[PDB]
Amino acid sequence: FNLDVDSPAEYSGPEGSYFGFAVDFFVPSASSRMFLLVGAPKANTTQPGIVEGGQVLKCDWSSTRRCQPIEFDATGNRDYAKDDPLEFKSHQWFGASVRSKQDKILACAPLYHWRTEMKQEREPVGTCFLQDGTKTVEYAPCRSQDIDADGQGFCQGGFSIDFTKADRVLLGGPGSFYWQGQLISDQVAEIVSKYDPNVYSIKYNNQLATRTAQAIFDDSYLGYSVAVGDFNGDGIDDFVSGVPRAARTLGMVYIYDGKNMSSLYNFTGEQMAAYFGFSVAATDINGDDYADVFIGAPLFMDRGSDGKLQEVGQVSVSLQRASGDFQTTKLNGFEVFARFGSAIAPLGDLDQDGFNDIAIAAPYGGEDKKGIVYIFNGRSTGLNAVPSQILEGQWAARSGCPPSFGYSMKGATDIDKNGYPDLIVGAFGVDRAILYRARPVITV
Amino acid sequence: TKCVVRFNFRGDMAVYALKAVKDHLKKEGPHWNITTHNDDEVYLVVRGIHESDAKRIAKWVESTIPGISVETQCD
Ligand SMILES: *[C@@H]1O[C@H](CO)[C@@H](O[C@@H]2O[C@H](CO)[C@@H](O[C@@H]3O[C@H](CO[C@H]4O[C@H](CO)[C@@H](O)[C@H](O)[C@@H]4O)[C@@H](O)[C@H](O[C@H]4O[C@H](CO)[C@@H](O)[C@H](O)[C@@H]4O[C@H]4O[C@H](CO)[C@@H](O)[C@H](O)[C@@H]4O)[C@@H]3O)[C@H](O)[C@H]2NC(C)=O)[C@H](O)[C@H]1NC(C)=O
Ligand SMILES: *[C@@H]1O[C@H](CO)[C@@H](O[C@@H]2O[C@H](CO)[C@@H](O)[C@H](O)[C@H]2NC(C)=O)[C@H](O)[C@H]1NC(C)=O
Ligand SMILES: *[C@@H]1O[C@H](CO)[C@@H](O)[C@H](O)[C@H]1NC(C)=O
Ligand SMILES: *[C@@H]1O[C@H](CO)[C@@H](O)[C@H](O)[C@H]1NC(C)=O
Ligand SMILES: [Ca+2]
Ligand SMILES: [Ca+2]
Ligand SMILES: [Ca+2]
Ligand SMILES: [Ca+2]
Ligand SMILES: [Ca+2]
Ligand SMILES: [Mg+2]
């Protein structure tokens, strides 16, 4: 209810670049100033022969509003042999997935392809660039000797990423092992230290990962979307992973132990093709010190009293109890074909009432399918099913694709330094990104 | 001596890959115990492969048919 939607900070990129596809905040531990990170996966770079390589832009905030590219990669395609390219950066979608912790920026390119040494091919392995301090290294955990569809060749590593409070990188690669999906977790120190630009396949010592399973798990896309939080009381963030096409396309969410990857919990959807697990989030929504799990299901159809089914979207909210048990309730969308629940973004305690709040988007709702973001407040009994605030998209589609306001969101970072965390919302269909700041809340 | 090698075929081309591998194995080992299954999960198993032959066929597959998961178990 306290977001300022009257005077928001609006940023834009080159037309056709999908600027605003993915957003995050950049907050160095002691720079005094903060930047917004806005991806533009189809942007035209200055690289020697790269078309629509994609880029990540570091957007300022105080004073004026300008965006500039980060030179994570200032070169083109390296050769393997004379007239035989090693890698293909054109149309790699760099900036499609971006996350940052302190001065560490992890920017990924899920459609990056390369040949491997064993044979000449073009496999969508996916790579990430990790920048910290004054050094940049390439992180590519799916770029290895285990190649092609049965291996990590089609991993698309970096599709979904996050950070663990233990200074570990959590990376989801939904295409591994014929799309069973894989989670990979490693240490920042290992990633930065064990770096050699002449080595394409790098092994790390403290890496954890999931493994290939039976064909009955094929095309499940595990690691489609990831999140972290403590689900066993060991003080170590565990791993939450959406698996949207699992269990006869009911969709599932898996929780793995953050120290040794042993499986801890399993959530299963109710309706086929609701695509349950599209997006997940882990946060304490009721003040119990136990992380709770939020699972989106954007294609869910809500059957009415006459038997008619309306596609509205659904979000499942489960509270963690000390026993390890979960208490689950359901929240349905409000508009037909708006796809409510496609994007879930914890805001932290948006209104400073002691309970965390969460934003849930419905990117194709509202007038002319501009897109709507719903703000839901928390409480001691779990999430309040009635939204407190409605954020509407402000732009018309220019070339078929809806602005898709609310497609990608990030909160829980306070940029204007007032104690109330702000929210950045992408609208890539019109190459825009908009920052909504949270107002102080006065109780009388 | 003797080992067991299993090939797991997945994807839209699983049956084409199965045929390509099966035909290769039949030519390399006309009298190998080659068993195939096309029920739900598609796979090929060769039993009694003469140990070194397990690596010889795995290498051929890796360099030819794109992505077949091969498991070798030797005593
Ligand atoms: C949340 O939900 C997930 C699934 O959605 C669940 O994970 C799955 O757990 C099962 C185990 O319950 C995994 O299935 C197998 O587990 C065995 C471990 O041993 C148990 O099962 C055997 C069965 O005979 C018992 O004898 C034994 O006592 C135990 O009970 C593994 O050994 C299996 O490994 C296979 O792959 C290996 C790869 O190297 C092979 O070497 C091995 O031989 C197995 O191959 C199988 O398939 C082959 C196909 O050709 C076949 O030829 C072989 O003969 C054999 O049948 C295997 O892992 C299952 O994989 C897990 N799936 C996923 C996605 O993780 C979580 O546990 C659950 N979590 C919670 C909290 O509920
Ligand atoms: C990036 O540059 C490419 C090449 O200049 C642009 O692609 C061209 O777009 C025009 C639009 O009228 C087409 O007629 C050409 O045929 C396209 N060429 C190729 C090779 O695709 C692309 O649109 C630019 N993208 C961005 C975001 O600026
Ligand atoms: C992971 O660590 C926990 C610690 O309590 C232990 O109980 C569990 O058995 C371990 N699992 C594996 C696979 O090592
Ligand atoms: C509609 O008709 C059914 C009987 O088929 C009845 O039980 C129901 O109460 C009616 N609903 C309304 C709103 O009249
Ligand atoms: Ca833990
Ligand atoms: Ca809780
Ligand atoms: Ca609150
Ligand atoms: Ca603020
Ligand atoms: Ca297909
Ligand atoms: Mg087919």
Residue numbers in the entry:
A (entry chain A): 1 to 444
B (entry chain C): 1 to 75
Paper text:
The RGD (Arg-Gly-Asp)-binding integrins αvβ6 and αvβ8 are clinically validated cancer and fibrosis targets of considerable therapeutic importance. The highly homologous integrins αvβ6 and αvβ8 bind to latent transforming growth factor-β1 and β3 (L-TGF-β1 and L-TGF-β3) leading to release of active TGF-β1 and -β31–3. Here, we describe a method for computationally designing hyperstable RGD-containing miniproteins that are highly selective for a single RGD integrin heterodimer and conformational state, and use this strategy to design inhibitors of αvβ6 and αvβ8 with high selectivity. We found small α/β ferredoxin folds were able to scaffold the RGDLXX(L/I) binding loop without clashing with the integrin while making additional contacts with both α and β subunit (α- and β-loop respectively).
To investigate the accuracy of our designed structures, we used single-particle cryoelectron microscopy (cryoEM) to determine structures of human αvβ6 ectodomain bound to B6_BP_dslf and human αvβ8 ectodomain bound to B8_BP_dslf. Using focused refinement, the nominal overall resolution is 3.4 Å for the αvβ6 - B6_BP_dslf complex and 2.9 Å for the αvβ8 - B8_BP_dslf complex, although the resolution varies considerably due to the intrinsic flexibility of both integrins. As expected based on the negative stain class averages, the αvβ8 - B8_BP_dslf was found to be exclusively in the extended-closed conformation. The cryoEM model of αvβ8 - B8_BP_dslf complex is also very close to the computational design model (complex RMSD 0.7 Å). In the cryoEM model of the αvβ8 - B8_BP_dslf complex, there are 12 interacting pairs of residues between integrin and the minibinder; as in the design model, the α-loop interacts with αv, β-loop with β8, and the RGD loop spans the two subunits. Y172 of the β8-SDL2 loops bends inward to form a hydrophobic patch similar to the conformation in L-TGF-β-bound structures. For the LXX(L/I) motif, B8_BP_dslf has the sequence MAVY which packs against SDL2 of αvβ8; in L-TGF-β1 the corresponding sequence is LATI. The cryoEM structure reveals the molecular basis for Y in the fourth position of the LXX(L/I) motif: we find that Y16 forms stabilizing interactions with A115 of the β8 subunit and interacts with the less bulky L174 in the β8-SDL2 loop. The equivalent position in the β6-SDL2 loop, Y185, is more bulky and we hypothesize that the steric clash would interfere with binding.
